[PDB]
DNA sequence: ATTCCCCCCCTTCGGTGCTTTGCACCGAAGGGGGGG
């Protein structure tokens, strides 16, 4: 019946009181579903028919489960959640199949009516009061109060997850060799026993849970592969994601494209070389989620490339603890990176991608370091270990970058792999002034009121130039002055600025940015052979 | 002893960062041992306060230790060689109304099970009230060769000759040396400087106004010290401790000891431990650190090399020095 | 049409700090995907 587990004490925030919301009208079949589910839970003792006193109320409604024939009963507890104390969540993440070890015996179980089995604290039951309306809005409704955890309340998930852990602790204490993965009420049970010998211990768990009021119907007890677990398709030796359907829609809207980006961003964990930047760029500026977005030729190609990747089958493999993890990162263009994790070559544990542009000005080295850090954190999350990286950056290039950078940076144990796109610094500012080369003393000073600057350069050998700038700022004008100095110099220049800002933008050695002026300065810096840059106080 | 929060201040709600299989296994072994002797106890989700926890392997001991990041909680509570004292802090009980804030959550590899939450039943290790309720100890660290601590003076290079760059830089190591070292108001160098020519008495009068050290710059026990670290390249680290900008209480240099020419984070982490230990014995407060490192880079690796029971507050710089 | 909770990404906007009142960076809140 109901779990004999001890109830978690719940309180409202101090000063606050219970809800007094009303009930919204409902469809005539939702009313029937709500009252039948409700006659059932009242017979089973899950709700206590209230009546002429409760000064509390909360709207209720129903949706359809994945079963497509049953209904889920929900309560819109938003106001109560506002007025309810705060809980600390214990679910710190989602388990991944790539972190699962190959187990000879595997079974997946599901606790029926998971929430309606854990009791609710007695003092808090009044606040959960609700009213089931009247068939064809006619008579007064049959009101109830929740004796168990409701679906819609914000303290229900944490309480249920703690209760399930407390229930499963006795079983795991006497049975160490079975791995148990508990996600809410979904249980993955793995063992190093044969079929006829771990069923005996699965029917023992099914009765240990049943002793605590937790039932387990045998229609959601999966005993044979492939197991449908956490949105995957677990095979005895491999695993894969459940089939992913991509839209084939003639006209695309904003939401119609964010769905596409979300699908590809989830398929990118196993499928290799998935890119969304050209499609995710179509979701800029536009805010109304109903307008037909035309598909650019760059996004059309990405859609074309993505759909043939999703045309062939991909399957990962399981973790082997007696091996080392290898991550192979690849640069794929426009700041997008792809990585693969494996222990044996050509058999991937999981695929991924990185296309986050963190900062205003950055280069390939910093982006690669960011990707390495992300992969390291993710691997520590999944396997508890730091992998070995196959980076496309030379050892000498990384040594040059890290030995001449103010910010402290590191990459764990790694090795270089010869792939066509390599990570390199496209230019390097030199330390000592160059003989034979002229100087390009730059100043662009603006006016903060009329937005008028004077961007120019003066040469030691008698050469000056000045270009008036409008609608610009102090920093933009001096960047334009540096650009002007680079524009009319030979294949060697000595640039001396008055700007501690423009030095920072250039000394960091970027290669791409959203600012057009910085991109033009970078482009011109690549052409020049040797460049010196220093700042002086005016 | 009744301890309470700062009026208007609630309690820590910090998330738990991921750990490695070896740290989790050590933490489970340690917490199970402590729970069986009553020092900690299991709690549920009804407690909304959380502090991060992690494990460190102590120097030349091969024995793991538990460390709780009691930084948010300490800033909200209303209250020479070094060795350990936290152990003894396990012998005085806490206050039942305060035990709710000292709660942590041990994570699980691959998110196998929901995190196991605990809370302290005795005085924790890393909590400023801890030394209190209970020769100089910081808070749990009970206090190397403190016989040579000084303030590095700034010096313009000595050799010969003068480039329109060496002078164009000189007025830079100088005009900047102003709010810091006054007296160098030298202004005549703008004659072989601003003039436009190829970059390819006052000197010693200021080489003397630099000889004199961190004049004045006295310490007040009201503003917590700020420490900013600079990477000088090839395992060379320099730091400055200033209460108010442009007047340094102490500056120094940290050369290459650990992580030989391979690991910046190992060098930075040990430098922070070195400066903090320096501050405690002379000032008594852990300075706020402005670290020349990214956010993700420091948070991922600083626990791998940390060897100190205390954890100072720090911020990360984002602009060149 | 109506709920909660967790993880991820991608975009947008407000707060913060230094500075040259712009500019750069970060955190939180929308949209989406997945999960129970
Ligand atoms: N859409 C949802 N809204 C709120 N809570 C939900 C939702 N889906 C699942 N949950 C929570 C409450 C459920 O008791 C718990 C476990 O999910 P699930 O097993 O699908 O439901 P259940 O146990 O109520 O039904 P079933 O009898 O089909 O197992 O997760
Ligand atoms: Mg299910
Ligand atoms: Mg179920």
């Amino acid at each position: 019946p109901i779990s004999p587990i001890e109830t978690v004490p719940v309180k409202l925030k101090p000063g606050m009181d219970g809800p007094k919301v009303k009930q919204w009208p409902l469809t005539e079949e939702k009313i029937k579903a709500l009252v039948e589910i409700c006659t059932e839970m009242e017979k089973e003792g899950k709700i206590s028919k209230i009546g002429p006193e409760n000064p509390y109320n909360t709207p209720v409604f129903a949706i359809k489960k994945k079963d497509s024939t049953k209904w889920r009963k929900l309560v819109d507890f938003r106001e109560l959640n506002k007025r309810t104390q705060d809980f600390w969540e214990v679910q710190l993440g989602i388990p991944h199949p790539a972190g699962l070890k190959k187990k000879k015996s595997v079974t997946v179980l599901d606790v029926g009516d998971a929430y309606f089995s854990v009791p609710l604290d007695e003092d808090f039951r009044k606040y959960t009061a609700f009213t089931i309306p009247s068939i064809n809005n006619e008579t007064p409704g049959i009101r109830y109060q929740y004796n168990v955890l409701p679906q819609g309340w914000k303290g229900s998930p944490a309480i249920f997850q703690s209760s399930m852990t407390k229930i499963l602790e006795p079983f795991k204490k006497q049975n160490p060799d079975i791995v148990i993965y508990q996600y809410m009420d979904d249980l993955y049970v793995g063992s190093d026993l044969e079929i006829g010998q771990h069923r005996t211990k699965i029917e023992e768990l099914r009765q240990h849970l049943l002793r605590w009021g937790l039932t387990t119907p045998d229609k959601k007890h999966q005993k044979e592969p492939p197991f449908l677990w956490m949105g995957y398709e677990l095979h005895p030796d491999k695993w894969t994601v459940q089939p992913i359907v991509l839209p084939e829609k003639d006209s695309w809207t904003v939401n119609d494209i964010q769905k596409l980006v979300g699908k590809l961003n989830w398929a990118s964990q196993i499928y290799p070389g998935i890119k969304v930047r050209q499609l995710s760029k179509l979701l800029r500026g536009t805010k109304a989620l109903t307008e037909v977005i035309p598909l650019t030729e760059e996004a059309e190609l990405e859609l074309a490339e993505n759909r043939e990747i999703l045309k062939e089958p991909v399957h990962g493999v399981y973790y082997d603890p007696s091996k080392d993890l290898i991550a192979e990162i690849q640069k794929q263009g426009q700041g997008q990176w792809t990585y693969q994790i494996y222990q044996e070559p050509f058999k991937n544990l999981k695929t991924g991608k990185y296309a986050r542009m963190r900062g205003a000005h950055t280069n390939d080295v910093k982006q690669l370091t960011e990707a390495v850090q992300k992969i390291t954190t993710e691997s520590i999350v999944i396997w508890g270990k730091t992998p070995k990286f196959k980076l496309p950056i030379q050892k000498e290039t990384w040594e040059t970058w890290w030995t001449e950078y103010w910010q402290a940076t590191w990459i764990p144990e790694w090795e270089f792999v010869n792939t066509p796109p390599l990570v390199k610094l496209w230019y390097q500012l030199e330390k000592e002034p160059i003989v034979g080369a002229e100087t390009f003393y730059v100043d662009g000073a603006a006016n903060r009121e009329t937005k008028l600057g004077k961007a120019g350069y003066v040469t030691n050998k008698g050469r000056q130039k000045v270009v008036p700038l409008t609608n610009t700022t102090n920093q933009k004008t001096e960047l334009q002055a540096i650009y002007l100095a680079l524009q009319d110099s030979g294949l060697e220049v000595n640039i001396v600025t008055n700007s501690q800002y423009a030095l920072g933008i250039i000394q960091a050695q970027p290669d791409k940015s959203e600012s057009e002026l910085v991109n033009q300065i970078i482009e011109q810096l690549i052409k020049k052979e040797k460049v010196y840059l220093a700042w002086v106080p005016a | 002893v009744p301890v309470k929060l700062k009026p208007g201040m609630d309690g820590p709600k910090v998330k738990q960062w991921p750990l490695t299989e070896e740290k989790i296994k050590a933490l489970v072994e340690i917490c199970t041992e402590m729970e069986k002797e009553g020092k900690i106890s299991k709690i549920g989700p009804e407690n909304p306060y959380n502090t991060p926890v992690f494990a460190i392997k102590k120097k030349d001991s091969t024995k793991w230790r538990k460390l709780v990041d009691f930084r948010e909680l300490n800033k909200r509570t209303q209250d020479v060689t070094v060795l350990d004292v936290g152990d003894a802090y396990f012998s005085v009980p806490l206050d039942e109304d305060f035990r709710k804030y000292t709660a942590f959550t041990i994570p699980s590899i691959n998110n196998e099970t929901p995190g196991i939450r605990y809370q302290y039943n005795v005085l924790p290790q890393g909590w400023k009230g801890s030394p209190a309720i209970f020769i100089y100890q910081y808070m749990d660290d009970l206090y190397l060769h403190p016989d040579k601590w000084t303030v590095q003076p700034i010096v313009l290079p000595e050799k010969d000759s003068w480039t329109v760059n060496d002078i164009q830089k000189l007025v830079g190591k100088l005009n900047w040396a102003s709010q810091i070292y006054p007296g160098i108001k030298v202004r005549q160098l703008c004659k072989l400087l601003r003039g436009t020519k190829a970059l390819t008495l006052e000197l010693a009068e200021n080489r003397e106004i630099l000889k004199e050290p961190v004049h004045g710059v006295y310490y007040d026990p009201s503003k917590d010290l700020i420490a900013e670290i600079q990477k000088q390249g090839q395992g060379q680290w320099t730091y400055q401790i200033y209460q108010e900008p442009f007047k340094n209480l102490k500056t120094g240099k940290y050369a290459r000891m650990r992580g030989a020419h391979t690991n910046d984070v190992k060098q930075l982490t040990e430098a922070v431990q070195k400066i903090t230990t320096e501050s405690i014995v002379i000032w008594g407060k852990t300075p706020k650190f402005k670290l020349p490192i990214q956010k993700e880079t420091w948070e991922t690796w600083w626990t791998e090399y940390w060897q100190a029971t205390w954890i100072p507050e720090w911020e990360f710089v984002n602009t060149p020095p």
Side-chain angles (χ1 to χ4, degrees), chain B residues 34-58 60-77 79-80 82-84 86-129 131-141 143 145-146 149 151 153-154 156-157 162 164-167 169-173 175-178 180-187 189-190 192 195-196 198-200 202:
Chain B
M34 260 178 321
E35 178 202 3
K36 286 162 62 182
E37 42 179 6
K39 317 289 196 62
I40 75 187
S41 77
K42 282 165 178 275
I43 69 173
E46 88 269 5
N47 190 338
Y49 310 129
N50 195 51
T51 78
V53 71
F54 64 102
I56 62 163
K57 192 117 84 157
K58 191 51 67 176
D60 198 74
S61 64
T62 68
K63 156 182 163 333
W64 293 82
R65 297 192 28 111
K66 183 172 90 91
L67 230 59
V68 247
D69 188 15
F70 278 146
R71 264 188 280 150
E72 291 280 334
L73 179 72
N74 276 309
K75 94 173 155 34
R76 279 168 201 245
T77 307
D79 174 36
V80 191
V82 213
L83 231 96
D84 62 292
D87 200 294
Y89 289 118
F90 279 158
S91 325
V92 152
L94 208 32
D95 249 23
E96 305 78 63
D97 40 288
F98 210 82
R99 299 176 177 181
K100 43 164 146 293
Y101 317 104
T102 68
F104 39 100
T105 314
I106 284 137
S108 100
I109 301 108
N110 202 26
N111 293 131
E112 187 186 58
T113 63
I116 310 104
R117 320 231 314 133
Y118 294 88
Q119 96 172 4
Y120 266 86
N121 297 150
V122 288
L123 284 184
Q125 185 220 270
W127 179 57
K128 92 203 237 181
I133 308 206
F134 211 45
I135 305 228
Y136 190 49
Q137 97 261 53
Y138 169 42
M139 65 184 174
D140 284 82
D141 223 354
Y143 297 71
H145 286 294
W149 287 345
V151 213
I154 265 319
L156 319 150
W162 279 134
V164 203
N165 199 26
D166 262 308
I167 319 191
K169 268 344 202 144
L170 209 67
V171 192
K173 215 179 160 153
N175 285 29
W176 153 87
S178 153
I180 303 111
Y181 277 179
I184 313 149
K185 229 15 146 270
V186 152
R187 88 263 79 77
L189 270 191
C190 250
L192 322 122
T196 63
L199 275 86
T200 223
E202 293 166 297

Side-chain angles (χ1 to χ4, degrees), chain A residues 504-515:
Chain A
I505 309 308
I506 290 171
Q507 175 118 0
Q509 286 159 284
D511 39 356
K512 77 199 136 39
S513 210
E514 50 278 62
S515 154

Side-chain angles (χ1 to χ4, degrees), chain A residues 365 369 393-411 414 425 428-429 431 507 509, chain B residues 230-237 256 259-265 267:
Chain A
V365 181
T369 318
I393 180 178
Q394 314 262 351
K395 310 299 288 277
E396 67 261 23
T397 304
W398 170 255
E399 180 84 14
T400 296
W401 169 262
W402 93 260
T403 47
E404 292 153 16
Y405 199 52
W406 54 94
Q407 253 175 73
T409 173
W410 188 50
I411 286 175
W414 67 282
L425 296 174
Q428 156 204 87
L429 310 183
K431 302 342 163 283
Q507 175 118 0
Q509 286 159 284
Chain B
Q230 286 125 20
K231 181 164 126 221
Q232 307 294 339
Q234 326 335 333
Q236 288 289 44
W237 297 93
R256 189 193 58 79
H261 262 153
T262 332
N263 219 329
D264 268 337
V265 185
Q267 283 160 347

